[PDB]
Design an enzyme around this catalytic site. Structure first.
Site, PDB file in Angstrom:
ATOM      1  N   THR A 124      20.180  48.193  19.478  1.00 31.94           N
ATOM      2  CA  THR A 124      19.254  47.062  19.465  1.00 31.94           C
ATOM      3  C   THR A 124      18.625  46.921  18.086  1.00 31.94           C
ATOM      4  O   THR A 124      18.422  47.913  17.392  1.00 31.94           O
ATOM      5  CB  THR A 124      18.127  47.271  20.513  1.00 31.94           C
ATOM      6  OG1 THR A 124      18.679  47.533  21.807  1.00 31.94           O
ATOM      7  CG2 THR A 124      17.148  46.124  20.582  1.00 31.94           C
TER       8      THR A 124
HETATM    9  B1  LIG Z   1      18.583  48.840  22.437  1.00 32.26           B
HETATM   10  O1  LIG Z   1      17.389  49.746  21.973  1.00 32.26           O
HETATM   11  O2  LIG Z   1      19.814  49.634  22.053  1.00 32.26           O
HETATM   12  C1  LIG Z   1      18.789  48.423  24.074  1.00 32.26           C
HETATM   13  C2  LIG Z   1      17.719  47.465  24.600  1.00 32.26           C
HETATM   14  C3  LIG Z   1      18.160  46.710  25.816  1.00 32.26           C
HETATM   15  C4  LIG Z   1      19.413  46.505  26.247  1.00 32.26           C
HETATM   16  O3  LIG Z   1      19.468  45.853  27.456  1.00 32.26           O
HETATM   17  C5  LIG Z   1      18.162  45.613  27.790  1.00 32.26           C
HETATM   18  C6  LIG Z   1      17.713  44.999  28.939  1.00 32.26           C
HETATM   19  C7  LIG Z   1      16.341  44.879  29.106  1.00 32.26           C
HETATM   20  C8  LIG Z   1      15.462  45.377  28.149  1.00 32.26           C
HETATM   21  C9  LIG Z   1      15.938  45.999  27.001  1.00 32.26           C
HETATM   22  C10 LIG Z   1      17.314  46.116  26.815  1.00 32.26           C
HETATM   23  N1  LIG Z   1      18.927  49.565  24.980  1.00 32.26           N
HETATM   24  C11 LIG Z   1      20.014  49.815  25.728  1.00 32.26           C
HETATM   25  O4  LIG Z   1      21.018  49.105  25.698  1.00 32.26           O
HETATM   26  C12 LIG Z   1      19.971  51.093  26.561  1.00 32.26           C
HETATM   27  C13 LIG Z   1      21.236  51.344  27.424  1.00 32.26           C
HETATM   28  C14 LIG Z   1      20.601  51.695  28.772  1.00 32.26           C
HETATM   29  C15 LIG Z   1      19.953  53.109  28.707  1.00 32.26           C
HETATM   30  C16 LIG Z   1      18.682  52.811  27.869  1.00 32.26           C
HETATM   31  C17 LIG Z   1      18.830  51.312  27.588  1.00 32.26           C
HETATM   32  O5  LIG Z   1      19.447  50.838  28.803  1.00 32.26           O
END
Ligand SMILES: *[B]([O])([O])[C]([C]C1=[C]OC2=[C][C]=[C][C]=C12)[N]C(=O)[C]1[C][C]2[C][C][C]1O2
Ligand SMILES: *[B]([O])([O])[C]([C]C1=[C]OC2=[C][C]=[C][C]=C12)[N]C(=O)[C]1[C][C]2[C][C][C]1O2
Ligand code: NA
Ligand code: NA
Ligand code: NA
Lengths: 213, 229, 232, 214, 199, 240, 203, 235, 223
Positions: free
Chosen positions: E1
């Site tokens: 992210t």
């Molecule tokens: B990022 O920090 O890599 C990401 C944020 C993300 C992804 O999908 C969503 C949905 C709702 C809120 C935030 C969000 N994180 C992830 O992809 C991770 C994979 C899984 C385990 C922790 C989190 O969810």
């Protein structure tokens, strides 16, 4: 992981005479291989005829000390009299044992006068076991000081020696010598020696310099 | 809360608060239940104080589950409490046994709730009598559950205003081998005995229950039945 | 029907007022404080010859240096006696010492207005204790006698009478009590005043007598000892 | 807090004739990342008290809320009484010890500076409830670099002027910028005197890099 | 992210990538990580998806009732505190960082960081696994007084740069511009991304 | 009578007598006034002195409920202080949750609902208290609210509670406060209190003055001794 | 620690050493490892010093409460049972306490062994502590139920002195008690190293 | 009569009769006087003996080194309220390592004693106190009542025939602030004496004295300790 | 397990395999993984079989109560919200990976709900051990606004890729087409593996099993 304890050092000692009691300590507060302060004496006046020496984890020394003060007031209000040296000692054992599964990391030595006006020493382990002694050493240098006290105050290992009682003058010089020797060999003992003398007149204090390194 | 019972025995051995709750039911709008050979009919007088009331907003004939339905006489707000609790109880049975709740089982569970309100602290009984219909053992069921927590299985019955006369009309006009369509005609006829004014498909409510489950009749279906009179 | 924590227009709790009235129905007890010890004496009020007089306990030992005389509803006193005994042993455990006669009296007095209906625990006190107590014992302040009533008010007394004939016995104690009187003279005066106010003729089975002296533990008088004292 | 997140490094403090001075850089590190290079780690408690905090910033911000609200509560009474530096220090010891004893500490080491009734106050509190007073204090890595310099000067001259204390603190911040890898050349200097609490910043030390040619 | 928020005169710009990944697996390649907390308040979601969605929902619920009782739209500071309080109270059980930004009639366009239950107002802020690779870029490219279009361009370039270096960031870029006028949502597709050195 | 012992009981005519009896305790109490002006809110209280043995300032009827909020009470004083503590805790809670000073209309709504809750059951009795809340903010302006024992909360330009509530009201109506400042309004507040005070019936009294406005930086504080003495001398000279 | 107790013709002998150790450091040379509950009830102590002192003093308070409540002393079986239940209540908590409750009641001399696990055994000979095996060897070799008081005092003092010689966690003095029908008597408090020197000089 | 038995019931006149009945408990108890100078706060009390053979009831209690109280009303309620005060003082020294400001302790008494006056089945505290203290604002004399109301006093008297004591205190209150401790105690004793009938006088049996000030911790003088103060005047 | 979902022109199509494995051993060759929630809302389950069974049962039950009370057809966003908040409270310990597909007053919607309580609205999704095989087929040929027959074909191909490619998947392809006029439950829409017959002549002559004890209890008395 988080450890709720830390070793802060310090050495305490108490001697009971026919009509006196001495409670002495060094004034160094340490952490790791560094000095927090060179002016942290470990003697706490409880009543006019009882003082307590506290050594170990300083967060527990501060806390346990404040608990004893609150408890003496609570007792004076309920019983209309101050707690005796013996009563403080019996109560302290129960406060320490109340924490048998999360101990107070404190080595305590009580010094005062009993109800006959004679000198009284009471020493504890962190979880509350105790007894009355004629003399006792506690804290980092306790193992260094104790065998000298056993020899010079208890007269142990001496043949053909007069078992002359301990005078205040003789005890004062012995407390000064053992704390000079302790400061030479224990890294946690140093800076100054606070001596508390309890008699019928009251409590006198002396401060004598110790090695600063 | 008040932890003492509000319903207690009088020197003559009566639970006077349950007798007064029954007076609330006796003052309520008429309700009829008829268990036909192949189904059950529930009919009620849904008469409103003014034309300004939106008739299709609130209902007296209510579904509990796919095969169970309800009607009442007495206190409308108390009724809604029992409908919510009956719908809930039927879902708990379904989660555990994976089979639609038998009508007698639902009636027994709702009757227990009603009994509680005659003994529990700081509460008065419900001023409602329910008429529960259902289909479960390849056969129809019609039960009455009154404010004390007592229940009765009926072939046909009436509740509320002019109920003693409705039951006599049903007594002479009821046959165990009547079919659902004929029983709807008979149910509307029992209501017509005590109905004051002209009976339209908007001031009466009908619910049916057969092999296909419980459902309310639409005002168009009620109009077609009223055409026959 | 008002609640148990209702005040009267005079500023007193009705329930406490009535618990004081309940003591006017208990058997009379006397206590006399003397520089040589404190004596406690009480009438047993035996209803039948078939009743075992040894099973009527109106003078009890709280600790070796403290005794207690009771009057009023005796089943209510059994709870306070045990709470006093428990407090002495809890104090001994913690402080390695005996309690003062005043501290024990106060400990029992702390339970006094601990009654009520709303905002209370499942089985809390619904009414006060209908008991009057006379604590008698020796401590560092010498022999001491303390009185206590259902209101929780506790006070030190040189001589005190509680019970049905407390008004008459207090008059006799006032006319006979001298601060410098001996323990033998206090014991006899107690027995004289008790004989006077008692319905039955007093004997070694009808009454109970006990002493706590500086140097002597709490002592319950035996039949042989009671008969030897009745002689004078 | 079981694992600190954004953390602050050393907090200094030294008593002088007429007050106390505390110093702390404006960095919030996330491990080795200098994530926030412009956050204040100093707090004015009341007119007599000031506080600086090492350790977790989120735990410091929480303490700043709780402390700030206590001061508002007291000021609503307007009864002539106010928390002394010593009472705030005392409260903070109990607060830290209590959290330590529940095995959920507030991950900080703090320096409380104060001036009340003509006396200078300087006190330390750590996440375990270890507290004490001294003429000089230095938390974190500053206990190893800054405290030897504060003590060296206080040995020769036990009572310093406000200017003497200030120059010494500025020399300590320079040594800390050079030797502490978790520091930043942006800091505050807060002073407490009879006039009250003054927080100055953002400050910087003039660095010298001539040893790069030796 | 990779999440990013920039303050300008009269509002804020917020951006995010669109990749949701369970290790080496991209579970969702078009996820919008910009969630509305109120009419003119948004948050940028990063960390645990379940935690981030749970906090965002409770904050939106708390702020809706707050807004109704106060007879006004909530302040961005009230929204940032609401988020910060949940994140701090449950810091040992939540693993999400919700950046809160939006517009007010009192303070205007404001950006707030709540990382680990802390609270800080920033001229701009970056978060997520991808933010690591663009710290130097945002420090070199940020200029005070940028216009709404310059902020969008900055957020897009920075997020595209992180998306190219970070395995855990990718997809499209979602942009949101919050001003007194309302909110503008915009999408920069994975084919229309700004190009830089990529060898 | 009969229908008037519990707040959980309606009388046959749709009234809750326990709440009306709580209001009688407010009416039987001394008068307090509040006036909202162009740059703030000013409070004045007729504080009857029951004994010359009391200190000046004892039994205060003006409170600091938050740094920016002031409270003026009338009625049973222990109930009033209990309500000041509820208002304080409510204002403190808002700051913990949202990070800024509680808006006065919100504080009044919140406190009024605690008051309202005490008008529904036999388990508790209604508060024998009526109080005003005054505040000043740059974004909100000057605000004056008044809550009664029933739980009602309204916004005011001028307000009075107690013995001479209607007497003080006809005197407040004579002021064009919307275009006046706190500094001029203090004199008017002290004057109206001196008019409604019954010298014969309630012998002596102490005038209590509070204010929160542009002059104080939106902080609720006591009107300094000098301004109080000028308003007090002005009140006495206008009385002649 | 070394504690021993045995019943014989003339009652019950009870002896203890006096050493306390903090690891290999001798923290106390002379501690009292016997609690005198009343004139007819003793308790020997071994294990964790604080556990021993607190729980045996808690048993003493309960025995005292029993006397006030019933105007009679508690039996040795009931007192040992009370302590055993205190240990059961804290099982798995890490208490360390071995004790022998020795007394004289309406059933004659009583001797019970009680553990921190809740073990409670009546018997006429027990030994607890780190030096218990050494005390058993000596005590078993010289035991006869018909030992005279002086012959019993010699066996007790010898079992403890010999245990202190081999066990590094035992030493100091022997504190010996003799439980008679009219209550216990403290027989002696004798330096164990002086006893061992005396035994050696007779070789 | 029907608005008589519950604190939750307001009478039609806006009165809580149960609070007014609790106030009577103070009036029935013996008189106590509290007064102050620029340096000392003094409490003087008339101790009541149930008989010649009974001791005089303790009227003066110790709360903390800087605070002491005089009671009038139900003694069990006085003990309960004293224990509350002692604990609140202990917590202040444990947490802040500083004595609890006297006016702040009085506020806590007001909040604590108001709670039972608004809840069903609960009752007011049937006790009134006079509180002598000394803090950063000098000496203090506070008054607490069953109604939960509290007063900051120059001087005060409560109990049976206490109006007599208040008449004396109202006259001499001009002198009080400049009095030395002996002159201040004497004034308190003369005010206490006024409550007493013309037959009886102040003895070293029915007099209790409590003193706290700039140089003195709260001290209670009762029998022989009362004699130095009782040598100043003879009716 | 291979469970897939797809949004087409007039609705949604849910797909599932029919194998249940007990750690490398096939226990059930024909299990139903497409669960009913509401007449126009269905749910594919993967993960811990009991957790998927009880969570779908619980939300169908909550949705019947919701629909009875409201008098309205249930919304797909409600079933997702209820599922999410229940799963979040259990911190992933309720191992239900769900694909919620449905039609409401706002049209066809498709959601992926994970054991921890996270969700995603998507035009197409796949869950289970065979999710990447199904997802590759969907990414390769999904196009928006597909016809019913084109979307059903893509769905059968996606579930089949998982059946053949994943050891934890097998059996038949079940499907559920949800449109505005209700749902068509197509159990065994395709069988990628044709009847695996054999010459399984395994008869035992009566008496080959040695018996030690025999007891007959008749029931004709009750009949
Ligand atoms: B990022 O920090 O890599 C990401 C944020 C993300 C992804 O999908 C969503 C949905 C709702 C809120 C935030 C969000 N994180 C992830 O992809 C991770 C994979 C899984 C385990 C922790 C989190 O969810
Ligand atoms: B023995 O088991 O080694 C001994 C028992 C002991 C020591 O001090 C006392 C005091 C009262 C009763 C028993 C008792 N234990 C020890 O030497 C140790 C000292 C302390 C810490 C571990 C153990 O107890
Ligand atoms: Na040294
Ligand atoms: Na050194
Ligand atoms: Na990438």
């Amino acid at each position: 992981r988080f450890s709720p304890y830390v070793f802060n050092g310090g050495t305490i000692l108490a001697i009971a005479g026919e009509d006196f009691a001495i409670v002495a300590s060094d004034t160094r507060l340490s952490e790791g291989f560094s000095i927090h302060t060179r002016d942290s004496p470990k003697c706490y006046k409880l009543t006019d005829k009882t003082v307590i020496g506290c050594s170990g984890f300083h967060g527990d020394c501060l806390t346990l000390t404040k608990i004893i003060e609150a408890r003496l007031k609570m007792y004076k209000h309920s019983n209309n009299k101050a707690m005796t040296t013996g009563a403080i000692a019996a109560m302290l054992s129960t406060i320490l044992y109340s924490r048998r599964f999360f101990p107070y990391y404190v080595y305590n030595i009580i010094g005062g006068l009993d109800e006959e006006g004679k000198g009284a020493v009471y020493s504890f382990d962190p979880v509350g076991s105790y007894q009355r002694d004629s003399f006792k050493a506690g804290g980092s240098a306790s193992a260094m000081l104790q065998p000298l006290l056993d020899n010079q105050v208890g007269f142990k290992n001496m043949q053909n020696v007069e078992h002359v009682p301990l005078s205040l003058d003789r005890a004062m010089r012995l407390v000064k010598d053992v704390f000079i020797s302790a400061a030479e060999r224990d890294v946690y003992t140093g800076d100054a020696l606070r001596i508390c003398i309890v008699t019928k007149e009251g409590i006198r204090e002396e401060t004598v310099s110790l090695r600063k390194d | 809360g008040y932890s003492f019972s509000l319903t207690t025995f009088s020197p003559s051995g009566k639970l006077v608060q349950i007798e007064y709750a029954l007076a609330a039911v006796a003052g309520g709008a008429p309700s009829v239940g008829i268990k036909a050979a192949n189904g059950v009919v529930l009919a009620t007088e849904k008469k409103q104080k003014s034309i300004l009331y939106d008739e299709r907003s609130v209902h007296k004939v209510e579904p509990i589950t796919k095969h169970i339905g309800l009607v009442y006489s007495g206190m409308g707000p108390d009724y809604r409490v029992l409908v919510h609790r009956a719908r809930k109880l039927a879902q708990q049975y379904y989660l555990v046994y994976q089979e639609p709740i038998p009508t007698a089982q639902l009636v027994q569970r709702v009757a227990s709730v009603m009994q509680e309100y005659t003994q529990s602290g700081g509460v008065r009984p419900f001023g409602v009598s329910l008429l529960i219909c259902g289909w479960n053992e390849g056969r129809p069921y019609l039960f009455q559950s009154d404010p004390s927590g007592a229940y009765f299985a009926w072939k046909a019955t009436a509740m509320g205003k002019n109920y003693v006369n409705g039951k006599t009309f049903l007594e002479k006009r009821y046959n165990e081998d009547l079919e659902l369509e004929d029983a709807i005609h008979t149910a509307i006829l029992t209501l017509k005995e005590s109905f004051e004014g002209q009976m339209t498909e908007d001031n009466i409510e009908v619910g049916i229950c057969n092999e296909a489950g419980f459902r309310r009749l639409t005002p168009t279906e009620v109009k077609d039945y009223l055409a026959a009179i | 029907d008002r609640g148990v924590n209702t005040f009267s227009p005079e500023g007193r709790l009705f329930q406490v007022e009535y618990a004081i009235e309940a003591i006017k129905l208990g058997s009379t007890a006397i206590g006399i404080q003397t520089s040589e010890g404190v004596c406690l004496a009480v009438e047993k009020r035996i209803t039948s010859p078939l009743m075992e007089p040894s099973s009527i306990e109106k003078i009890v030992e709280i600790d070796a240096h403290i005794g207690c005389a009771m009057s009023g509803l005796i089943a209510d006193a059994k709870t306070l006696i045990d709470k006093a005994r428990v407090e002495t042993q809890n104090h001994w455990f913690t402080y390695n010492e005996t309690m003062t006669v005043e501290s024990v009296t106060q400990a029992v007095s702390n339970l006094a207005l601990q009654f009520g209906e709303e905002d209370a625990d499942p089985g809390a006190m619904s009414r006060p204790f209908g008991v009057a107590l006379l604590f008698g014992g020796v401590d560092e302040k010498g022999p001491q006698l303390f009185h206590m009533d259902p209101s929780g008010t506790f006070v030190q007394c040189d001589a005190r009478a509680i019970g049905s004939a407390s008004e008459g016995a207090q008059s006799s104690l006032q006319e006979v009590y001298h601060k410098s009187m001996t323990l033998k003279e206090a014991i006899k005066s107690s027995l004289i005043i008790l004989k006077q106010v008692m319905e039955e003729k007093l004997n070694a089975t009808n009454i109970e007598l006990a002493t706590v002296q500086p140097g002597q533990n709490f002592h319950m008088f035996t039949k042989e000892e009671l008969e030897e004292v009745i002689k004078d | 807090t079981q694992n600190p997140m954004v953390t602050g490094t050393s907090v200094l403090g030294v008593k002088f004739e007429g007050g106390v001075v505390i110093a702390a850089d404006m960095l919030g590190s996330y491990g080795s990342l200098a994530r926030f290079r412009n956050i204040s780690r100093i707090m004015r408690v009341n007119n007599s008290t000031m506080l600086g905090a090492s350790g977790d910033y989120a735990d410091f911000q929480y303490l700043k809320q709780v402390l700030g609200q206590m001061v508002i509560d007291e000021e609503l009474l307007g009864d002539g009484h106010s928390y002394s530096p010593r009472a705030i220090h005392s409260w903070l010891t109990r607060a830290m010890y209590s959290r330590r004893s529940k095995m959920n500490p507030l991950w900080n080491t703090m320096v409380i500076g104060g001036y009340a009734d003509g006396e200078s106050f300087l006190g330390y509190v750590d996440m375990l409830g270890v507290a004490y007073e001294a003429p000089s204090l230095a938390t974190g890595y500053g206990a190893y670099l800054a405290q030897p310099l504060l003590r060296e000067v206080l040995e020769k001259q036990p009572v310093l002027s406000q200017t003497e204390a200030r120059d010494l603190v500025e020399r300590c911040m320079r040594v800390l910028y050079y030797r502490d890898a978790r520091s930043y050349n942006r800091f505050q200097i807060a002073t407490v005197t009879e006039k009250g609490v003054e927080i100055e910043g953002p400050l910087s030390t003039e660095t010298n890099w001539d040893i790069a040619h030796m | 992210t990779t999440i990013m928020a920039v303050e300008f005169d009269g509002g804020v710009v917020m951006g995010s990538d669109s990749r949701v990944s369970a290790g080496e697996a991209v579970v969702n390649r078009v996820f919008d990580k910009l969630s509305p907390l109120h009419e003119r308040i948004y948050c940028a979601l990063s960390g645990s998806a379940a935690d981030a969605q749970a906090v965002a929902d409770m904050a939106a619920y708390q702020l809706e009732l707050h807004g109704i009782e106060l007879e006004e739209p909530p302040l961005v500071l009230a929204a940032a505190n609401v988020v910060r309080n949940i994140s701090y109270k449950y810091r040992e059980d939540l693993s999400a960082h919700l950046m809160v930004a939006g517009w007010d009639q009192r303070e205007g366009g404001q950006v707030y960081g709540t990382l680990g239950g802390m609270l800080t107002r920033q001229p701009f802020a970056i978060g997520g696994s991808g933010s690591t690779f663009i710290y130097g870029y945002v420090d070199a490219a940020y200029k005070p007084g940028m216009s709404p279009e310059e902020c969008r361009r900055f957020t897009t370039d920075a997020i595209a740069l992180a998306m190219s270096r970070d395995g855990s960031s990718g997809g499209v870029i979602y942009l949101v511009t919050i001003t007194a006028a309302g909110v503008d949502h915009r999408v920069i597709l994975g084919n229309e991304l700004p190009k830089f050195y990529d060898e | 009578t009969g229908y008037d012992l519990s707040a959980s009981t309606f009388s046959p005519d749709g009234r809750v007598f326990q709440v009306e009896y709580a209001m009688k305790a407010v009416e039987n109490s001394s008068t307090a006034i509040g006036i909202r002006c162009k740059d703030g809110v000013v409070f004045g209280v007729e504080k009857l002195v029951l004994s010359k043995l009391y200190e000046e300032g004892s039994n205060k009827r003006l409170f600091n409920v938050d740094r920016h909020v002031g409270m003026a009470v009338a009625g049973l004083l222990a109930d009033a202080r209990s309500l000041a503590d509820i208002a304080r805790e409510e204002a403190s809670n808002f700051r913990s949750n949202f990070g800024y000073n509680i808006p006065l209309k919100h504080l009044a709504d919140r406190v009024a609902m605690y008051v309202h809750a005490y008008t529904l059951y036999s388990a508790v009795r209604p508060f024998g208290c009526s109080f005003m809340l005054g505040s000043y903010s740059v974004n909100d302006g000057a605000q004056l609210y008044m809550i009664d024992p029933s739980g009602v909360s309204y916004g005011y330009w001028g307000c009075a509670i107690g013995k001479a509530r209607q007497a003080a009201k006809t005197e407040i109506e004579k002021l064009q406060m919307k275009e006046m400042t706190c500094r001029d309004i203090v004199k008017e507040v002290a004057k109206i209190i001196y008019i409604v005070h019954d010298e014969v019936k309630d012998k002596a009294f102490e005038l209590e003055l509070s204010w929160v406005g542009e002059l104080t930086n939106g902080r609720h504080e006591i009107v300094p001794k000098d301004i109080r003495e000028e308003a007090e001398k002005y009140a006495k000279e206008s009385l002649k | 620690t070394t504690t021993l107790a045995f019943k014989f013709q003339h009652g019950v002998i009870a002896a203890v050493d006096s050493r306390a150790s903090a690891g290999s450091y001798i923290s106390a040379l002379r501690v009292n490892k016997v609690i005198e509950i009343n004139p007819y009830l003793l308790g020997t102590m071994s294990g964790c010093a604080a556990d021993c002192q607190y729980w045996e003093r808690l048993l003493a308070k309960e025995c005292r409460l029993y006397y006030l409540r019933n105007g009679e002393r508690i039996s040795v079986s009931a007192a040992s049972k009370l302590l055993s239940n205190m240990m059961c209540q804290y099982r798995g908590m890490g208490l360390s306490m071995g004790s022998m409750i020795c007394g004289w009641d309406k059933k004659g001399p009583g001797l019970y062994y009680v553990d921190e696990h809740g073990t409670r055994l009546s018997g006429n000979m027990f030994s607890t502590g780190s030096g218990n095996t050494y005390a058993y060897g000596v005590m078993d070799s010289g035991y006869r139920p018909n030992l005279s008081p002086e012959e019993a005092y010699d066996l007790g003092r010898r079992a403890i002195a010999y245990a202190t010689h081999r066990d590094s966690y035992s030493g100091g003095v022997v504190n010996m008690y003799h439980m008679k029908e009219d209550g216990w008597v403290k027989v002696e408090s004798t330096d164990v190293s002086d006893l061992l020197h005396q035994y050696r000089e007779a070789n | 009569n029907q608005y008589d038995n519950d604190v939750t019931v307001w009478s039609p006149q806006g009165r809580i009769h149960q609070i007014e009945y609790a106030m009577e408990a103070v009036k029935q108890g013996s008189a106590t006087v509290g007064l102050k100078s620029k340096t000392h706060a003094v409490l003087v009390a008339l101790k009541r003996a149930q008989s010649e053979l009974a001791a005089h009831q303790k009227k003066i209690l110790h709360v903390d080194n800087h605070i002491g109280i005089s009671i009038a009303g139900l003694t069990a309620d006085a003990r309960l309220l004293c224990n509350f005060m002692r604990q609140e003082c202990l917590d202040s020294r444990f947490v802040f390592d500083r004595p609890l400001p006297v006016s702040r302790l009085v506020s806590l008494i007001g909040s604590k004693t108001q709670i039972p006056t608004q809840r069903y089945g609960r009752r007011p505290y049937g006790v009134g106190l006079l509180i002598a203290g000394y803090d950063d604002m000098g000496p203090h004399i506070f008054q607490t009542c069953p109604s939960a109301n509290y007063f900051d006093c120059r001087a005060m008297s409560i109990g049976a025939r206490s109006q007599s004591a208040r008449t004396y205190l109202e006259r001499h209150m001009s002198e009080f602030m400049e009095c030395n401790l002996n002159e201040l105690v004497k004034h308190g004793l003369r005010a206490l004496r006024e409550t007493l009938p013309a037959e009886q006088d102040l003895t070293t049996k029915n007099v209790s004295i409590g003193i706290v000030g700039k140089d003195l911790e709260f001290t209670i003088y009762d029998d022989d300790d009362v004699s130095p103060f009782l040598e100043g005047l003879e009716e | 397990t291979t469970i897939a979902g797809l949004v087409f022109q007039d609705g949604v199509i849910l797909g599932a395999d029919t194998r249940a494995t007990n750690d490398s051993v096939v226990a059930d060759k024909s299990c139903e993984k497409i669960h009913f929630i509401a007449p126009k809302i269905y749910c594919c389950g993967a993960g811990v079989a009991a957790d998927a069974e009880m969570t779908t049962r619980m939300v169908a039950s909550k949705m019947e109560l919701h629909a009875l009370s409201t008098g309205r057809e249930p919304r797909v966003a409600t079933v997702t919200r209820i599922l999410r908040q229940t799963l979040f409270r259990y911190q992933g310990h309720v191992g239900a990976s769900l694909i919620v597909g449905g039609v409401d007053l706002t049209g066809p919607q498709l959601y992926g709900v994970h054991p921890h309580g996270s969700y995603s609205r998507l035009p197409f999704t796949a869950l289970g051990s065979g999710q990447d095989a199904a997802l590759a087929v969907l990414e390769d040929r999904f196009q928006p606004n597909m016809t019913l027959e084109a979307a059903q074909g893509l769905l059968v191909e996606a579930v089949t890729a998982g059946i053949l490619g994943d050891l934890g998947s097998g059996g038949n392809v079940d499907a559920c087409v949800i449109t505005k006029t209700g749902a068509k439950l197509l159990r065994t829409l395709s069988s990628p593996t044709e009847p695996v017959k054999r010459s399984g002549r395994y008869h035992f002559v009566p008496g080959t099993t040695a018996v030690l004890t025999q007891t007959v209890k008749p029931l004709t008395l009750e009949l």
